[PDB]
Structure formats: C-alpha cells, structure tokens
Amino acid sequence: DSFVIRGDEVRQIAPGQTGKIADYNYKLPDDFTGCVIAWNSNNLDSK
Amino acid sequence: ASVYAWNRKRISNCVADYSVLYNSASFSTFKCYGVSPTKLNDLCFTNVYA
Numbered sequence: 726d727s728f729v730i731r732g733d734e735v736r737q738i739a740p741g742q743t744g745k746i747a748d749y750n751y752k753l754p755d756d757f758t759g760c761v762i763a764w765n766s767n768n769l770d771s772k
Numbered sequence: 773a774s775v776y777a778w779n780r781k782r783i784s785n786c787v788a789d790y791s792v793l794y795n796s797a798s799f800s801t802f803k804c805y806g807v808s809p810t811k812l813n814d815l816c817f818t819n820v821y822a
Contacts (some may be wrong), residue, residue: 733797743810745795 726751729770735763781822789813 730738730746737744740757747753773779790812794802802809 729766732765738763783820783822 728751734744734746736742737747738751738753738761739747740753741755742753790809793799794809794812807815
C-alpha cells in the first residue's frame with residue numbers, strides 16, 4: 726500500500742492507533758501482520 | 773509558571789469534549805495513563821485538575 730502524508734502523522738499508521746488519517750482514510754487491522762516503511766520526501770513532493 | 777512553581781487549575785461543575793484536544797495539531801505529546809484519550813468523552817469524574 727503506497728501513499729504520502731505529513732511527517733507528524735507517521736505515528737498514526739499502525740495497528741490499534743487513532744487519529745484523522747487512521748480513522749477517515751487508512752486504517753490497519755488491529756492484528757496486522759507486516760511492516761510499515763517510511764522516509765521523508767521533501768526533495769520530491771514539496772515545491 | 774516555572775517548573776518549580778507550577779499552577780493548578782481545578783475544573784468542576786461543567787462539560788468538556790477531550791477529542792478537540794486529542795485531534796489538535798498543536799501538541800508534541802498526549803500520553804495517557806489509566807484512561808485512553810479516545811474514551812474520555814464516554815466517561816466522567818468528580819474533579820479534574822490541570
């Protein structure tokens with residue numbers, strides 16, 4: 726699953742977690758199996 | 773206040789929504805103990821202090 730978010734919201738993308746990104750558009754299962762991988766993209770996605 | 777001095781508001785006789793604070797971009801932490809910040813709106817207390 727591939728997408729962009731503001732850096733403050735990276736902590737919402739987990740099993741069990743809650744917030745506007747975790748509720749309203751990207752919810753993980755509360756027993757998720759897998760990895761969440763992220764890096765800053767300020768060199769590509771900012772203008 | 774200075775951290776040696778720290779004032780203490782007592783909150784009483786009133787209604788509050790805690791989700792307004794929990795969804796705010798203002799805060800660098802929100803760590804909760806003995807209650808969860810998602811649950812506070814469903815639950816209530818004799819005094820609250822800040």
